[PDB]
Amino acid sequence: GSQILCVGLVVLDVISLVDKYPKEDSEIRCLSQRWQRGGNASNSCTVLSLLGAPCAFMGSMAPGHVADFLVADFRRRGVDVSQVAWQSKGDTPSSCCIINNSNGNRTIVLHDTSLPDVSATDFEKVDLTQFKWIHIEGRNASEQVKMLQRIDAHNTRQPPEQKIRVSVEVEKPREELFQLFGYGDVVFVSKDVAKHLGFQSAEEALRGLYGRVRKGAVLVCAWAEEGADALGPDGKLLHSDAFPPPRVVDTLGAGDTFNASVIFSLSQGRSVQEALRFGCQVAGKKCGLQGFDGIV
Amino acid sequence: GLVPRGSQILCVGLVVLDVISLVDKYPKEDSEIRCLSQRWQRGGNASNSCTVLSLLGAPCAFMGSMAPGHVADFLVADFRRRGVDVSQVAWQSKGDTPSSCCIINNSNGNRTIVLHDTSLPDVSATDFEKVDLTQFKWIHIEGRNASEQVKMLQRIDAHNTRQPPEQKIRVSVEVEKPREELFQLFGYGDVVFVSKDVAKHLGFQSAEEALRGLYGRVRKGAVLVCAWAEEGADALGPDGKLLHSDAFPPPRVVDTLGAGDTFNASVIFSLSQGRSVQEALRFGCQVAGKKCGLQGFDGIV
Ligand SMILES: N#Cc1c(C(F)(F)F)cc(N2CCN(CCO)CC2)nc1N1CCC[C@H](CO)C1
Ligand SMILES: N#Cc1c(C(F)(F)F)cc(N2CCN(CCO)CC2)nc1N1CCC[C@H](CO)C1
């Protein structure tokens, strides 16, 4: 096991950088525009790569000129595309991403393209010996749950010296996804999921959702400018203050940067208190830059 | 390839990649939403007039600024899908190929637009100086960078001076945006198109008031054209006889986006085919009418 595997989406992020958020029925010229390789798991691969950690992306891609761009970006970053479930039917998904340059706020208008998701079938064809860690971005829950059981089964037939650490992300407030809570050594729950379930703080959410997690797991919840908090088996709550930049110019992928940084510090054998802190650290550096270049 | 001498209609102006997303409700800042539908279109006045001229059966070229990249590529493949000659494109070293994001609310029907950056440089008179004009029979300039386009227009005037009356490149100019800079373009070309919106800004309540009031701004022997949507279009020439065509509306109105560009291209085509100004006005109103009850330009002819 020498690589980190992120299992999720890869989306073309068509970015427009605005000085102020547009008002409805308004016509307002943008400051600048760019194309960016997106998708939560795809973004985490950019981050992991920049931290110096060898990694691989797993997700569905439809061949064309868009995927040609995406593949070229992944490669320039050293992301192992070898595990991509190439589809015949469907188009590559794209998002219109408006980044408010004044506060760094990002608004995403995603276009889902019928492109079939990576299945337990696609995952079954994967050589689990090259991976140190496996991160799954919560999309097709029932199917991903089968993929989780396949990693768990591999682990049971392996010494503790060679076990695959697993991490899950529950970003979208969807009931299907609450079953993934659930599985994995580390569980990232978003502020939006937490708020939808009735929680007003990262600590409230953590105490309220720790019953849901797998025995021995760490449930992590970041909370924008309020940093992030983690809850382990020991019952002790852990907290990290955020590392805000003086000028917050781009939050698109900040969470994906947080996730990756937490995964990396844990993969490096550092404490949960240290990992939480490094996640907030690297995520904060990103919010002061456009894109991902210059985070380290 | 070998373009035959005096065969092409050139259109000089904007090409933009319009990304259109139809949504249930308008997205609130910092949220992640999913659109109902999403389209990638090739926009721009000179760009749309080129599509229409191809469908009309005319050899046509586009001259506009583009930066090598992925946006330029999608835009070049749409031009080619529509038989437009992209050989005269002014490829830029710096700047972003124009791309706009449109958000259409399903309920109210309101259009929210995040216009392309001002980063890419427009076509210059030095860019235009390098063009061997002999393949063109008509050149249409969309009003943008007026000072520069004036020199372009002067070069065609210079070119024409040494040509017999039948080897003379006919010229048309479009003043569609209410910008003072553009009002100098009125004194150029054989055909001048003025928009309802430009006319309204100058304080004219009809196409009759616009033509009569603005004809003094045009050169000797020029035709000043003004369309007024549902009220059809007018044309006024050196004779002083105000001509009019009533609109030919479709049974149901589907898409008015590019209807002005369809009108412009059809008037240009009909005139370039040797037809009367009355015939051109009629034809432009007919073609533009059929487009309004159609999505895109697919079945306009
Ligand atoms: N780091 C960071 C971070 C920052 C900060 F500038 F504070 F750095 C701002 C922010 N914003 C979202 C809410 N906006 C509301 C405006 O009214 C402000 C911008 N989101 C952050 N993220 C989101 C991923 C996880 C990461 C965990 O620390 C927290
Ligand atoms: N036929 C026709 C016609 C109709 C209608 F179907 F209602 F009759 C509506 C309409 N518009 C209304 C909405 N405007 C909003 C966007 O600016 C665009 C113009 N314009 C039309 N014409 C016909 C003459 C030429 C003119 C060129 O602009 C295009």
Swiss-Prot record, chain A:
GO terms assigned for molecular function: ATP binding; fructose binding; identical protein binding; ketohexokinase activity; protein homodimerization activity
Regulation (activators, inhibitors): Requires potassium. Inhibition by ADP.
The protein's enzyme class: transferase
GO BP annotation list: fructose metabolic process; regulation of glycogen metabolic process; response to fructose; response to glucose; response to insulin; response to sucrose; response to zinc ion
Keyword ATP-binding among UniProt keywords: yes
EC number(s) per entry: 2.7.1.3
Tissue expression pattern: Most abundant in liver, kidney, gut, spleen and pancreas. Low levels also found in adrenal, muscle, brain and eye.
Gene3D superfamilies documented for this protein: 3.40.1190.20
UniProtKB keywords: ATP-binding, Carbohydrate metabolism, Disease variant, Kinase, Nucleotide-binding, Transferase
Chain residues that bind ATP: 106, 224-227, 253-256
Catalytic activity: beta-D-fructose + ATP = beta-D-fructose 1-phosphate + ADP + H(+)
CDD domains: Ketohexokinase
Pathway involvement of the protein, from the record: Carbohydrate metabolism; fructose metabolism
Residues annotated for beta-D-fructose binding in this entry: 13, 39-40, 43, 256
Assembly description: Homodimer.
Record protein name field: Ketohexokinase
Source lineage: Eukaryota, Metazoa, Chordata, Craniata, Vertebrata
Gene: KHK
Swiss-Prot record, chain B:
Coiled-coil ranges (or none): none
This protein's GO CC annotations: cytoplasm; cytosol; extracellular exosome
Known catalytic reactions: beta-D-fructose + ATP = beta-D-fructose 1-phosphate + ADP + H(+)
Alphabetical list of InterPro entries matching this protein: Ketohexokinase-related, KHK, PfkB_dom, Ribokinase-like
Substitution effect: residue 46 to T: In FRUCT; no effect on ketohexokinase function; decreases enzyme activity but no effect in substrate affinity; decreases thermal stability
Distribution of this protein across tissues and organs: Most abundant in liver, kidney, gut, spleen and pancreas. Low levels also found in adrenal, muscle, brain and eye.
Effect on the protein upon substituting residue 43 to R: In FRUCT; loss of ketohexokinase function; insoluble
Illness association: Fructosuria: Benign defect of intermediary metabolism.
Family membership noted in the UniProt record: Belongs to the carbohydrate kinase PfkB family.
UniProt name for this protein: Ketohexokinase
